[PDB]
């Protein structure tokens, strides 16, 4: 037993990380087959960031202007193109450690592991969620751009996030691996703000099921609720609406514990209206919303990769 915020094993991703340097600007890139993917702001200097014309800046770059290093091995760039907000550097050797992989665009509320990297080398791994406002609450310093978020299914790595920038209040914004930003953001040093964030209700419910499986059941009440009545209260506390699809996604956890979703909802409504009165759930004094139902199932059943 026990319950912790668990990241995917990072070995398959670590073998793909390289350093990309364009003059004084350096960040991380992802070396898959014979292509290195990286944020296009690597071609910027510090002055160019306020309002960069990326096409003009890249026309002035030759293949040799890109210094790509995989540890000790310098890699020769033999072509380059820009796709949306990512650069694609064709290199003259295919990465021998390339795993089986997919590019996916995740939905808000979904989670993934981030491999934080500087100068092409990993510093750490942690799990995070795509917030409803299309930011993530990561831990990223200057140099971390190009670090990637991913999920694993057996042997296939799904890359879903490339890091690009930090927004006010310390939240983070990036792209999918096709180079389209999550949310209404642009890779410019301009005034941009994350919008109002909400609490991912289906994830809170998954976490309360996790608590029940681990024997923390003090918050279980005896009432039930309707979906519509639940969503009236949730909305008041800045929770996302629970949909019937969400109720169905919670089905396996509900079956395991014998607690109908609408009964768990009745218990969440009381927590929201009355607080926790100094108590904790799973060691936490706030409700946690960064475990999906699949995350709970994986951790509580021990799925491996």
């Amino acid at each position: 037993s026990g319950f912790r915020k668990m990241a995917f094993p990072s070995g398959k991703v670590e073998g793909c990380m390289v350093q990309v340097t364009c003059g004084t600007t350096t960040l991380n890139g992802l070396w898959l087959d014979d292509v290195v993917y990286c944020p296009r702001h690597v071609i910027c200097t510090s002055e160019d960031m306020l309002n960069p014309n990326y096409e003009d800046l890249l026309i002035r770059k030759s293949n040799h202007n890109f210094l790509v290093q995989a540890g000790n091995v310098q890699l020769r760039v033999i072509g380059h193109s820009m796709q949306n907000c990512v650069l694609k550097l064709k290199v003259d050797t295919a990465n021998p450690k390339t795993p089986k992989y997919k590019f996916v665009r995740i939905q808000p509320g979904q989670t993934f592991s981030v491999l934080a990297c500087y100068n092409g080398s990993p510093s750490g791994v942690y799990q995070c969620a795509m917030r409803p406002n299309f930011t993530i609450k990561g831990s990223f310093l200057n140099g971390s751009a190009g670090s990637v978020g991913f999920n694993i299914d057996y042997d296939c790595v799904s890359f879903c996030y490339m890091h690009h920038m930090e927004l006010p209040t310390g939240v983070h914004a990036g792209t999918d691996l096709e180079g389209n930003f999550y949310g209404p953001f642009v890779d410019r040093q301009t005034a941009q703000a994350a919008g109002t964030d909400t609490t991912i209700t289906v994830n809170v419910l998954a976490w309360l099921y996790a608590a029940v499986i681990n024997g923390d059941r003090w918050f279980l009440n005896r009432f039930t609720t309707t979906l519509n009545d639940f969503n009236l209260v949730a909305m008041k506390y800045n929770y996302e609406p629970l949909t019937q699809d969400h109720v169905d996604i919670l089905g396996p956890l509900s079956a395991q514990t014998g607690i109908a979703v609408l009964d768990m909802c009745a218990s969440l409504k009381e927590l929201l209206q009355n607080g926790m009165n100094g108590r904790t759930i799973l060691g936490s004094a706030l409700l946690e919303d960064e475990f999906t139902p699949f995350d709970v199932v994986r951790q509580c059943s021990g799925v491996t990769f």
């Binding site: 600007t25 960040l27 944020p39 910027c44 200057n142 971390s144 930090e166 040093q189």
Partner: peptide, 8 residues
């Protein structure tokens, strides 16, 4: 404002 997280 938004800050691009490349490095020096």
């Amino acid at each position: 404002s938004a800050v691009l997280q490349s490095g020096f």
